[PDB]
Design a protein around this nucleic acid. Structure first.
Lengths: 533, 99, 92, 94, 106, 98, 84, 94, 105
DNA sequence: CGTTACCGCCATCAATATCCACCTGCAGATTCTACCAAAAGTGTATTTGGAAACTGCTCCATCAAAAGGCATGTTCAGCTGAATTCAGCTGAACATGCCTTTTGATGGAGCAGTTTCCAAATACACTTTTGGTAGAATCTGCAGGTGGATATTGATGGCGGT
DNA sequence: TTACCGCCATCAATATCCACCTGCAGATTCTACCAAAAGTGTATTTGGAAACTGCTCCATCAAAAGGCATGTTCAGCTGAATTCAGCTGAACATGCCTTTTGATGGAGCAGTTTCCAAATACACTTTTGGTAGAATCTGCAGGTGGATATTGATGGCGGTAACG
């Protein structure tokens, strides 16, 4: 109702008006002819102001508060887009937006909603289907098909064959997909799906809001698709026990139990690239392929009675039945984290309790050497989790290296790790003299360097120099095979690429606590359904 | 190719020497004139101001500010520090007795 | 961008905020200060305001007594000296 | 002995008016006398300077009123000005 | 037979302050209402300072005003403290004031 | 042996002296020092007892004020112990030094 | 008259401590006392001379408390209770 | 167009004895005038208060000599007293 | 025949000093030698401050005394600074001074 | 024990702006003449303020004693001041955009110069009231000692978690 | 399964608050005399209120410009955390000298009288300092060539550690 919304919505407009005299240009309709160039209507398709807001709130054109919020945010967007950034008008618009945020949340929270911020997703880079190794940077023209397939500028001339001509819509990378709304069957109110954690599989009967549930004095059905119900593995059990023991001895008031599960484990083989294959494999100096076992892990916590995923893992394990030098080795391919862990202060240490806990595990199996690549992702790049929160600072190489060194010092204090070093010191430790003596891991930086340099006894000194440039980035850990865990086939998360694709398709993002919980429950449902099929 | 950049403090000391070797006014004329006019109309409306009175009041103002800022520098150094923070101003004005 | 009148039409910055950030920076640097906290300036601004009613009001009290509505520099000098802040050069 | 002028009795009546049952000690009474005298030379010098500024050879109630506003802070200044104005009006009304 | 002190409704002496103003060589001429204004101002100041001193004495369960009460009254009033900021009181002491960090920091 | 922690007796006697107004300097050494300084300025000089008392009380008040300033300046430096730089800075800001 | 010497030490360590405590000082370093003495001396050097400077101006040889009030007032240290 | 008295040509004249080949600016000259006026006012006020304290109705060279000794620092005061005494002796013998 | 300043060997005007003393309402009577003595004191102070200002100007490679030179002369003299400790110089600035802790290394 | 490659320190060089003097037009400083009300110097009568001369007299300097509220010297450990490390981050240095600031020109609101003249200020001689104040008598708030109920500090019994 | 640091609980050794009671210097009440004020009453003088008006210069407004306001990246800052040699506070024994009450010689402050050099008040004559207009001179503020001076970047050489 028009009058119903007024008593709450008017104070925000009053606060906006109170900003004097920054809000003065926005009080009256902006006339393109009055102030100069008439291109205001050409750039801004739909002009509006604060007087229009007052008229709408008086007559009652607004039906829901979301329309009012959308109109205010569209006003802000128009002001930002038309006026230049360095102009004082942009600064006044930003100040008014900040004032609007610092009061809108409680006001519409009193109306039953969760928050009053127009949330737009992060500028995440898209991948390419053709090259499989090309990404589209920001402010770059790309070509999209049904918002599902992406091709870059270079891949347009690389494809052979057009397979209509004017059937793909020309678009730009400024589009931000809006959040989806779900409507309660009993009430009829539509509201964002993420804050209510409603999925079509767990509750196929329909969506019931909290108000209707409390009206009938009945609670929502229990969710059997939780992280604790996932199959237990020996490595997962070990990590879970380690984290639980650490949190128990810490005895933090805000600490909660953490569940670690291994949802994928499969045997794979890495094949030597053509250059090294021609130089060494044909001569018989080294085998063509190296077999290994890849194991994928996640870490979960129970926050507000909801499972939340906060840590990821991808490792490659070359056992004792693997040809040297990869024999009895573990390599950390990719790792990712979400900083919504509670408590925050223990969070970092908890991460160590995983990595160290992993190093204590394989050491008992027979693995002697670990290999870590301290390469933080670039801007917009996501390793495992989708759309990291904007306030999540990406560690710099120096900070990341210090973090790696710190956990390794803690582990050595715990006697688990014999020692750790950079790769060049290891090369001296075994007197490396040929490229074959260096471990060969899938997706590793060194195989690509070897291929490029062969395309560029020169190999030994060349590779030693490349060790010298980026020795601090790579960590080789000396600790000093039958794996008790069985093979767990999981095509969904086998490789970070399929998981990222699924997250992009279903908008399973981690930009906020509610969004992260929605994503975690979505992956829980997906993992519980993939094992059945 | 990472162009030349002075370390923090060298330019500061250099311009400190420059401003200590010079005597020109630092506060811009028009904003100070507006401040004086507004605070005068706070006490009495429709006042008129002589240019000499305005410049004398301004010069007294930069003198008072430079004195209090020197005292503030001494206070910041007193606590084994190099950066000034509000409690330095508070201590300076307290010892001066104005507060 | 937006055109129209601008000269003296955008006094928008508050009265005491008329003094620019680099102005207070320069005043502090002349006092030998080499590093300034971010929120110092406004506080000094407030301090500046205080000094004003230490002198100007008194000078006003002089000007109203001489049956004048225009303040003179000699009034300002007397107001300054009466607080123990004697200023030379404007006694003519 | 030469007479030493003091404001003992007048401040005594003031104390009786503000506190009929409260006395004053000799030392504190001397403090009161010194305070009132100090106010006296301060206000007299301010009035003389005000006369000197305008080349005025006569000090009247207006000059002393301006000097009071210069010296007395705020509420004390307004209340003293009002009391003095009432006293001057009463004096000139007879 | 009416004195100028009673004529102005004042307790302080108009004639005495007039004579002191004349003797102080402050100006060649003194107005007729000038001693009346001085008497009124001095009486007002004395009135409020004595009232505050009596309040301080009552707060200390004392019926006689002492210089300690005078110091307590003067320093507890911001306007009087500003008026007497460069005057030291005899046998008045200082206000009880201990800084925060000086207190125990358990 | 019963012993109070360092500061409790200090606070006790600080409150005691803040509740009292009696002079803390004995009259005779101060009078002797005043006589020495005056003799260095002018020999064969005589002193009224009231003049000596006024000198002593004014000096005590001035020391009390500078000690207030010194204490608050030491509080500024995150310390509870005064060291002569506090007094030097207080006197400099007061204008007695620079 | 006898030439008195070395009586700045008459301002004993407990006396300087008491004056500091009346100032609210909680802890006193060992080198405070003598320093204050010098400052104390300076203050006397500031006042006594001026008071002494009054004495011959009246053609007198005895310092009165009224000249003391004069000197303290002229040095911005106005004092009450001893006249003036 | 009233005549505004100032020590200007005198101080400049003094400059001729101390720096024949050095000039002075107008702002610095007003600084000089204000300095001389302030020193004169301080000396006159101190002489007046010394005269008043002693019940002395006449201000002589002794009173302002005492005023200079009070206000002016040590060797500056000694030099000023010496030159004042020399000037008074020269005037008397003139 | 001869001006009082000339008779007293002084450059400042004795008569003007006497007139200002008379008009200042400082005292009902003014002695004859008081203006001479005060003019002598003022002349000494002016001469010595001018000497110091000229020395500062010469050290600054300048032949005209500016307020900066006056400030340098006054602040570099301890007793002149003490006399003018509560006096502000127009267009004079402050002495070059950097504290030890603020200095590098 | 031998060899090589990394890390640290020192030698050496590209580049920026902060200096330096040189040079030239010029607002501003200096030199000289003329006019002249305003002071400044001289003369003479008048008044008076403070110097000298003696002496009354208050308090200033100086010596006696004694015993006890504090000054002086010593100990120890409680803990605050001082030194070291390092990580979050707030400021420093800098390129980018353009805008508020600065300079010059132009109406009249009042700042000042002139003139009349009257309410209002000295000047002074009596005359009356009244504030300092010698002196004796009665009243009274609190200095000071006593006793015990009421806060303030500290770590003693034992329970407990790191 | 023995020692150690916090905490909330009681408890013992102490300083604090305070009511109570007694001697007494100090605060308050009269009697009286009083020279210094207070004040009314005329004469004289002049400070400035009042009215009219010329001259400043202050507010307002035009364009040309030398600045200021934001965002980025990062070397250095500040403060939290830790540890510790050391000192200044609490306690105590010893005694130094204080603290006041007392008296006394006399140098020196101050009251009283006399009276002359000096200050004052005109009255007059004279130089003279402040201002206005002309004109010559000039110290130093923008540019500008120039040597030079500082400083952070980079490469090279030596110390050192580690593997064989």
């Amino acid at each position: 109702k028009p009058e119903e919304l007024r008593q709450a919505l008017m104070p925000t407009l009053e606060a906006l008006y109170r900003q004097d005299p920054e809000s003065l240009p926005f009080r009256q309709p902006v006339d393109p002819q009055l102030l100069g160039i008439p291109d205001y209507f050409d750039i801004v398709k739909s002009p509006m102001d604060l007087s229009t807001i007052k008229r709408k709130l008086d007559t009652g054109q607004y039906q829901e508060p979301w329309q009012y919020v959308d109109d205010i945010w569209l006003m802000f967007n128009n002001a930002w887009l038309y006026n230049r950034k360095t102009s004082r008008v942009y600064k006044y618009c930003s100040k008014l937006s900040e004032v609007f945020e610092q009061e809108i949340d409680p006001v519409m929270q009193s109306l039953g909603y969760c928050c009053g911020r127009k949330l737009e997703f992060s500028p995440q880079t898209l991948c390419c289907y053709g090259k499989q190794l090309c990404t589209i940077p920001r402010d770059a023209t790309y070509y999209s098909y049904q918002n599902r397939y992406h091709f870059c500028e270079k891949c347009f001339n690389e494809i052979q064959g057009e397979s209509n001509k004017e059937q793909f819509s020309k678009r730009k990378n400024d589009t931000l997909d809006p959040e989806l709304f779900v409507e309660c069957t009993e009430c009829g109110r539509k509201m964002h799906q993420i804050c209510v954690l409603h999925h079509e599989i767990i509750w196929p009967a329909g969506f019931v809001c909290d108000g209707c549930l409390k009206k009938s004095a009945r609670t929502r059905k229990e969710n059997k698709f939780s992280a604790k119900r996932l199959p237990s593995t020996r490595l997962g059990t070990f990590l879970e026990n380690r984290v639980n023991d650490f949190l128990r001895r810490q005895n933090h008031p805000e600490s909660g139990e953490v569940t670690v599960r291994v949802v994928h484990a499969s045997d794979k083989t890495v094949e030597v690239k053509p250059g090294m294959k021609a130089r060494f494999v044909d001569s018989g100096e080294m085998a063509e392929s190296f077999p290994y076992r890849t194991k994928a892990l996640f870490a979960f916590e129970e926050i507000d009675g909801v499972d939340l995923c906060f840590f990821g893992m991808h490792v490659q394990e070359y056992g004792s039945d693997c040809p040297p030098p990869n024999q009895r080795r573990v390599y950390i391919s990719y790792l990712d984290s979400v900083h919504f862990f509670r408590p925050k202060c223990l969070r970092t240490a908890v991460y160590h309790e995983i990595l160290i806990g992993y190093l204590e595990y394989v050491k008992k199996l027979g693995y002697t050497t670990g290999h870590i690549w301290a390469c933080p992702p670039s801007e917009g790049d996501d390793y495992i989790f989708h759309c990291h929160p904007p306030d999540q600072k990406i560690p710099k190489p120096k900070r990341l290296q210090e973090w790696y060194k710190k956990m390794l010092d803690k582990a050595v204090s715990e006697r688990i790790v014999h020692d750790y070093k950079d790769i060049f010191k290891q090369a001296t430790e075994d007197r490396l003299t040929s490229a074959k003596e260096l471990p060969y891991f899938e997706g590793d930086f060194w195989p690509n360097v070897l291929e490029e340099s062969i395309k560029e006894n020169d190999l030994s000194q060349k590779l030693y120099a490349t060790m010298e440039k980026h020795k601090e980035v790579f960590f080789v850990i000396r600790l000093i095979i039958v794996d008790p865990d069985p093979l767990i086939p999981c095509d969904l998360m086998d490789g970070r690429d399929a998981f990222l694709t699924l997250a992009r398709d279903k908008h399973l993002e981690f930009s906020s606590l509610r969004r992260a919980q929605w994503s975690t429950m979505c992956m829980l449902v997906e993992l519980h359904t993939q094992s059945q099929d | 190719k990472k162009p030349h950049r002075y370390r923090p403090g060298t330019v500061a000391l250099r311009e400190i020497r420059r401003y200590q070797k010079s005597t020109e006014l630092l506060i811009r004329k028009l904003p100070f004139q507006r401040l004086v006019r507004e605070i005068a109309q706070d006490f009495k409306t429709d006042l008129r101001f002589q240019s000499s009175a305005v410049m004398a009041l301004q010069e007294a103002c930069e003198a008072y500010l430079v004195g209090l800022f020197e005292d503030t520098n001494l206070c910041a150094i007193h606590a084994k520090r190099v950066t000034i923070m509000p409690k330095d101003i508070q201590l300076a004005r307290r010892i001066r007795g104005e507060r | 961008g937006k055109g129209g009148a601008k000269r003296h039409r955008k006094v928008l910055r508050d009265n005491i905020q008329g003094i620019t950030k680099p102005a207070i920076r320069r005043l502090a640097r002349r006092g030998g200060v080499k590093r300034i906290s971010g929120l110092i300036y406004e506080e000094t601004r407030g301090v500046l305001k205080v000094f004003l009613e230490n002198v100007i009001r008194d000078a006003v009290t002089y000007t109203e007594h001489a049956k004048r509505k225009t303040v003179t520099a000699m009034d300002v000098v007397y107001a300054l000296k009466r607080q123990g802040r004697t200023l030379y050069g404007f006694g003519g | 002995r030469s007479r030493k002028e003091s404001y003992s009795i007048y401040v005594y009546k003031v104390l009786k008016q503000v506190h009929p049952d409260t006395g004053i000690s000799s030392k504190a009474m001397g403090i009161m006398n010194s305070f009132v005298n100090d106010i006296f030379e301060r206000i007299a010098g301010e009035a003389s300077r005000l006369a000197h500024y305008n080349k005025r050879s006569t000090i009247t109630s207006r000059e002393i009123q301006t000097a009071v506003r210069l010296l007395l802070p705020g509420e004390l200044a307004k209340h003293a000005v009002s009391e003095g104005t009432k006293a001057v009006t009463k004096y000139t009304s007879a | 037979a009416k004195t100028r002190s009673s004529r102005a409704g004042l307790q302080f002496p108009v004639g005495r302050v007039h004579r002191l103003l004349r003797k102080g060589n402050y100006s060649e001429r003194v107005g007729a209402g000038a001693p009346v204004y001085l008497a009124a101002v001095l009486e007002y100041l004395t009135a409020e300072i004595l009232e505050l001193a009596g309040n301080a004495a009552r707060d200390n369960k004392k019926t006689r005003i002492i210089p300690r009460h005078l110091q307590l009254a003067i320093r507890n009033d911001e306007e009087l403290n500003k008026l007497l900021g460069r005057v030291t009181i005899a046998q008045g002491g200082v206000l009880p004031n201990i800084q925060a960090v000086l207190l125990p920091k358990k």
